[PDB]
């Protein structure tokens, strides 16, 4: 019925009102102190007063770090912008890694604005242009003004237009008998469709037929929009939306990533502060999450050291599964979790712990009940011994071949023999390694 | 006969549900206890409003990008509409830099150095480099020897705008490649020819996958004009900026001329068509849906965005085919004018707001809307169902034949606990 | 799922009105079957597809509204006064009888990547064939994910997952493996089949040796089929 | 190998008369009923009746009396080959291409066999065709940088090519791709050769090398 992939049995941290974690809540089993620390981090993010705060999720593999980050994002809700990332995303061939990191940093800060739009709309009744006295003088255009007559439900207005709006109106290919939508903020014109007052069965362009809009022709309506700071920086760096020829040709060019200067960022921050000061915009700081932080270079860590000192930086969460590991880009710097000691001082490390046999058994229980499968008790004990013997993930992803082998025998129940056939058909890392060592020609 | 109907949450309804869950500090046990007991009432009307219809908590409107503009707005026989969109970011430039670096005067050498580097020392000048011009004319085949000096001294956009397909002489060092030879065959070739069909893969993939009826999925968040530059006390800056932003050649090239205006040029003024400022250079968009960033509220998403409304629309076809008269039971009035809007769109016979007299005498009315004796009523439907028997019992007691009651429920919310 | 209309019949009269330059094009078409005869209105793409593949009076054409495809089936009038400009030998077909306009439901499959390339920029359908789709932004992919799920909720579209096959997977950097380990946990992810003919060899991008040339994080989340 | 039959109408223009209609329509002038064009070639003279729409192509390409033209049959689409040699001494100074009067009859049927490769079809289908957009002519006026051609275009090219072999029109001729001193190839190119040799449309590839027991480039122990 539904589609699942290694997750979506996790609905949150599952804490109490006092911040104490229950044993089984929200699909989580164990990791109580990690969940309590994550709940304190959620409360700190919801406080909306702190900038440049960094935590680190340190532990072994298959201990639930990405699950905890997903729990953070689900606990905060869809209003707070959550920006997941991997450490290999920052190596781009169009721009340097520093600008990619700052792009993600400005992408992790949200904004909510209530915007007033001046809108002319209606059905086009009369479309008559007027000509110029000298069209081949070169300077000035061919026409001078275009008269457009619009009508609505209980209203009819006649507009006199400058040519520049009429170029957009012609570019949307309007006619007499069409319902249009003109906004005055950017001069954009939207063509909705043919009016329903005429015959609708004599066309060949499979167009929609809309009725006349309610209200007057000229309105002012309030629209609540949710944008980030990175959207403002991108829209100002590559200007599209005006009716001048530079923004007209900016859409046709192939888009590319440039290095956004600090002057544009400061001016965008000043305009956003003026928007906030008038009671129009509100600020929603968010979470930036980086998976596999050991893959970052020393230059990216050194730029993170200065980017976390800024006054608009969000809360950044890192994950790593490394012991004493040399940092990439260096030859002798041995550091904990592959993170240099200049970043560790600005970090609050949260430690995840390995699981047990009963925790593995009940985790397999939730993964079986979220995949719409029912297993027996003996097969469940076999899978728990599998998880203790080989891997938790190997026991987790062996459920679907067991279900397929159960379905192909016209049964619903998963038995011990299906798990044994899953042993015989699919291997794990240790058995494949043991095959590789006792092999003739790298079998 | 009493049965209940389960519906599943939509994406939007789940998003406002998650927003309401994360907003009120996750006291979901207290919310369930307050629903089980019946300012937590003001909390739970928001959940009931989200579960009922998403447009009641937040009405759907025109989806458009955010306009990063400071234009001339109205602080409220024709009305003037003039383009006046600017950018909020202002770059301030002093007059001294402009007047002493960009404008020529008596004390600077802008025009002298421009002439010295572009005319006198240009290597395409036929008054000083006639041998190179003759060599390049033998190489390319240009009939004029001033073509290279003209090409090298005008901008690229100006070059591509006014490019003319003039003839070239055959006795030259350059002729046509194989690819262009294949190209010029299929300019106006029809279908079913082998060489035309072998060169028209892209249009075949276009009409094979029905790309002229697909919908747009992405629109940008913020749209902004170019950054305004401000110089105080100079009209030359304003004139140059207005000439650069609104150059008549490029603006006239990207749009078209009206047909009656072209008739006024050609017939009423005797202007030949070769002297027309050439037009139609804007690339045609993929669909008619891809020509704009504004998406209208469609009367199809309103049905699908509410699971109860979609299930009611699915269920109403069977009662229409079987010829019934259905009662809808409500609690609020926002759903009253919402169902008035939906029933006026669907064009169904429904009551305008005596009721008993019109119900008994007129059998043409289909759906009767009521808010908390009808003997001929056959089906009652509880949309926003409530489980207090003192209202439900008088509800089926108020309204001969077999009577079926329908209750629409949403999976995974307060109604499943309810 | 898409809904279209099919129109077939003899052409009685084609009227095409154009500007002096030739940009604005409009006109009317009078098509006719044995029982019915209606007059339609034409657009720019309609006139473009009528001008190419030359249609005269008496020819039988098939019209698909949702695809914009014009196919000429043949000729039936056998016009006597023919100006000898072409060597056309169009087939003699019969008169189509019955309903002029027929409705049918067609099904076509598009890939997700084609939707992102189409919605990426203004002329993305060119870049779908030329391969010039340089580093599509994440906001695009979020909006196509939302709209694809919305199309699933309307009943208009459904997702058919497929198989991604990577032959000689050991010729990959360690950053590719680190990206794969976190890209396999997404909702829109296919089933990935990898093949290796290598033993304990050097992992590319680092200085240790690993089984199958792959790090243990990738081997942790993989079931292994062996061959003999 | 593609074969095609072409029908042509070429020669010197004798007359050019747009014939008017019997009942002209109001609000218009010179309503053409048909176009009469007379041709003149070596040992051949033939007048023709044309579509009224050919007059726009006559006016577009500036065809006058005495010019030699070249009329495709089905598409129309006349074009000016040049000026006849009999008008070479018409003026003192004139920049005009003068060409000989064509031989043979005005009307002929010729079967033309043309040879192209699949890469030409790929690079011709990949680039956008002749239009009026700024992007196409701007890319024509710039440096032609190569691009990574996708497998979808190659798949459709193979599909339409196989469709035109099975009609009996086209014929596929494989050839030889000869790479010598293959010792300089990196191991990634060797793996892509391993992938590409399993294709259906692949030709025969011949390699040459003069090494003995040497390491493969890109590896330090093989």
């Amino acid at each position: 019925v539904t589609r699942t992939a290694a997750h979506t049995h996790i609905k949150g941290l599952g804490l109490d009102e006092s911040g104490v974690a229950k044993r089984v809540e929200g699909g989580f089993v164990g990791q109580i102190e990690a969940r309590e620390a994550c709940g304190v981090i959620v409360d700190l993010i919801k406080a909306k007063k702190m900038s440049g705060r960094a935590i680190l999720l340190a532990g072994g593999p298959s201990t639930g770090k990405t699950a905890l980050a997903l729990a953070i994002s689900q606990e905060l809700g869809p209003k707070v912008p959550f920006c997941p990332l991997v450490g290999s995303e920052l190596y781009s061939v169009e721009v340097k890694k520093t600008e990619t990191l700052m792009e993600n940093f400005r992408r992790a800060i949200g904004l909510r604005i209530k915007e007033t739009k001046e809108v002319y709309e209606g059905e086009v009744t009369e479309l008559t242009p007027e000509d110029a006295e000298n069209p081949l003088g070169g300077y000035g255009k061919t026409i001078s003004h275009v008269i457009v007559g619009l009508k609505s439900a209980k209203g009819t207005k006649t507009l006199r237009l400058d040519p520049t709006i009429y170029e957009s109106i012609q570019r949307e290919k309007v006619s007499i008998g069409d319902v249009i939508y003109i906004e005055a903020n950017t001069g954009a014109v939207k063509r909705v469709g043919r009016s329903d007052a005429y015959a609708t069965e004599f066309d060949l362009e499979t167009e929609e037929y809309v009725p006349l809009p309610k209200g007057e022709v000229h309105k002012k309506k309030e629209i609540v929009q949710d944008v980030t700071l990175h959207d403002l920086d991108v829209a100002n760096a590559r200007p599209q939306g005006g009716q001048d020829v530079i923004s007209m040709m900016g859409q046709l060019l192939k888009p590319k990533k440039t290095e956004i200067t600090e002057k544009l960022r400061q001016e965008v921050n000043k305009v956003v502060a003026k928007y906030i000061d008038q009671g129009v915009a509100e600020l929603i700081p968010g979470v930036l999450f980086i998976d596999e932080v050991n893959m970052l270079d020393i230059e990216i860590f050194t730029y993170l050291n200065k980017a976390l000192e800024s006054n608009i930086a969000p809360v950044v969460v890192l994950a790593s599964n490394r012991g004493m590991t040399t940092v990439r880009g260096t030859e002798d710097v041995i550091s904990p979790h592959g993170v240099p000691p200049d970043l560790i001082d600005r970090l609050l490390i949260v430690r995840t712990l390995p699981y047990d046999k009963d925790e593995i058994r009940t985790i397999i229980e939730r993964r079986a009940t979220v995949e719409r499968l029912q297993v027996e008790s003996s097969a469940l004990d076999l899978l728990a011994t599998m998880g203790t013997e080989t891997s938790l993930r190997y026991a987790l992803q062996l459920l679907a071949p067991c279900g397929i082998l159960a379905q192909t025998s016209n049964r619903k129940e998963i038995v011990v023999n299906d798990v044994n056939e899953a042993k015989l058909l699919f291997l794990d890392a240790k058995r494949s390694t043991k095959i590789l060592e006792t092999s003739a020609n790298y079998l | 006969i009493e049965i209940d109907v389960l519906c599943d949450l939509t994406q939007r309804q789940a998003k406002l549900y998650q927003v309401l869950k994360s907003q009120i500090s996750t006291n979901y046990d207290a919310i369930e206890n307050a629903a089980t007991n019946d300012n937590l009432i003001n909390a739970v009307m928001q959940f009931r409003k989200v579960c009922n219809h998403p447009d009641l908590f937040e009405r759907a409107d025109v989806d458009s990008p955010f306009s990063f503009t400071t234009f001339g707005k109205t602080t409220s026989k024709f009305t003037d509409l003039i383009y006046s969109s600017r950018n909020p970011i202002k770059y301030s430039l002093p007059r001294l830099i402009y007047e002493d670096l960009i404008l020529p005067n008596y004390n600077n050498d802008v025009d002298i150095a421009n002439k010295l580097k572009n005319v006198k020392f240009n290597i395409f000048n036929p008054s000083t480099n006639y041998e190179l011009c003759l060599f390049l004319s033998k190489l390319t085949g240009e009939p004029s020897l001033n073509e290279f000096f003209r090409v090298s001294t005008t901008p690229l956009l100006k070059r591509v705008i006014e490019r003319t397909n003039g003839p070239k002489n055959t006795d030259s060092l350059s002729f046509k490649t194989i690819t262009q030879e294949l190209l010029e065959v299929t300019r106006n070739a029809p279908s079913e020819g082998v060489m035309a069909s072998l060169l028209n893969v892209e249009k075949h993939a276009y009409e094979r996958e029905y790309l002229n009826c697909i919908q747009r999925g992405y629109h940008p968040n913020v749209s902004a004009p170019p950054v305004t530059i401000e110089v105080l006390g100079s009209s030359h800056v304003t004139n140059s900026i207005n000439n650069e932003l609104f150059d008549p050649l490029i603006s006239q090239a990207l749009s078209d001329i009206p047909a009656i205006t072209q008739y006024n040029m050609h017939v009423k003024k005797g202007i030949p068509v070769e002297d027309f400022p050439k037009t139609g250079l804007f690339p045609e968009p993929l669909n008619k849906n891809f020509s704009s960033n504004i998406s209208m509220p469609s009367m199809d998403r309103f049905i699908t965005e509410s699971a109860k409304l979609r299930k009611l629309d699915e269920l109403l076809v069977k009662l229409k085919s079987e010829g019934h008269r259905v009662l809808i039971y409500f609690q609020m009035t926002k759903m009253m004018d919402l169902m008035e809007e939906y029933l006026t769109y669907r064009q169904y016979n429904h009551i305008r707001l005596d009721l008993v007299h019109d119900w008994q005498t007129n059998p043409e009315i289909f759906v009767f809307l009521l808010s908390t004796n009808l003997t001929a009523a056959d089906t009652v439907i509880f949309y926003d169902s409530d489980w207090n028997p003192t209202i439900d019992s008088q509800a089926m007691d108020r309204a001969t034949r077999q009577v079926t009651v329908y209750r629409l429920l949403v999976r995974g919310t307060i109604e499943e606990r309810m | 799922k898409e809904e279209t209309e099919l129109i077939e019949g003899e052409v009685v009269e084609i009227q095409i009105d154009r500007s002096i330059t030739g940009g604005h094009k409009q006109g009317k078409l009078t098509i006719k079957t044995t029982d019915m005869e209606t007059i339609y209105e034409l657009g720019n793409k309609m006139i473009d597809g009528l001008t190419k593949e030359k249609v005269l009076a008496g020819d039988v054409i098939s019209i698909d509204k949702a695809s914009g495809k014009i196919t000429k089936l043949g000729r039936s009038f056998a016009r006597s006064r023919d100006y000898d400009a072409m060597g056309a030998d169009t087939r003699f077909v019969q008169c189509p009888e019955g309903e002029l306009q027929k409705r049918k439901t067609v099904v076509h499959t598009v890939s997700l990547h084609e939707i992102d390339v189409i919605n990426s920029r203004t002329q993305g359908f060119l870049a779908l064939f030329t391969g010039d789709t340089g580093e599509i932004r994440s906001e695009v992919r979020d909006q196509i994910n939302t709209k694809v799920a919305e199309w699933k909720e309307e009943g208009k579209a459904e997702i058919v997952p497929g198989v991604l096959f990577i032959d000689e997977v050991h010729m990959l950097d360690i950053e590719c493996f680190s990206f794969i380990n976190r890209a396999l946990e997404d909702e829109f992810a296919p089933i990935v089949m990898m093949a290796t003919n290598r033993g304990v060899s050097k992992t590319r991008g680092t200085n240790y040796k690993s089984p199958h040339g792959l790090p243990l994080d990738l081997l942790d989340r993989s079931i292994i089929i062996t061959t003999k | 190998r593609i074969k095609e039959t072409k029908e042509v109408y070429e020669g010197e223009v004798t007359e050019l008369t747009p014939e008017d209609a019997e009942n002209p329509l109001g609000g218009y002038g010179k309503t053409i009923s048909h176009v009469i064009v007379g041709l003149k070639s070596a040992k051949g003279t033939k007048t023709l009746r044309l579509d009224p729409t050919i007059y726009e192509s006559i006016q577009r390409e500036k065809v006058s009396i005495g010019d030699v033209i070249y009329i495709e049959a089905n598409t129309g689409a006349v074009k000016r080959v040049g000026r006849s040699d009999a008008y070479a001494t018409e003026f003192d100074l004139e920049t005009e291409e003068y060409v000989p009067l064509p031989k043979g009859e005005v009307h002929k049927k010729k079967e033309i066999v043309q040879d192209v490769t699949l890469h030409d079809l790929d690079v011709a289908n990949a680039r956008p065709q002749g239009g009026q957009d700024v992007i196409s002519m701007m890319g024509q006026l710039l440096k032609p940088k190569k691009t990574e051609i996708t497998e979808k275009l190659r798949q459709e090219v193979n599909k339409v090519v196989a469709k035109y072999i099975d009609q009996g029109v086209a014929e596929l001729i494989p050839g030889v791709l000869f790479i010598d001193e293959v010792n300089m190839l990196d191991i990634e190119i060797f793996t892509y050769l391993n992938k590409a040799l399993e294709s259906n449309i692949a030709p025969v590839v011949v390699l040459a090398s003069n090494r003995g027991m040497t390491t493969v480039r890109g590896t330090e122990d093989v």
Binding site: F202 | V267 | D17, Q26 | -
Partner: peptide, 28 residues
């Protein structure tokens, strides 16, 4: 009642007519 058709305005524009017996072309 029968809904009226859309108004058709072709002023200052050419015309190509393709009927059964004759084909016309009006030019300005």
């Amino acid at each position: 009642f029968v809904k009226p058709r859309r108004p058709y305005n072709s002023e200052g524009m050419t015309r190509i007519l393709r009927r059964y017996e004759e084909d016309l072309f009006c030019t300005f």
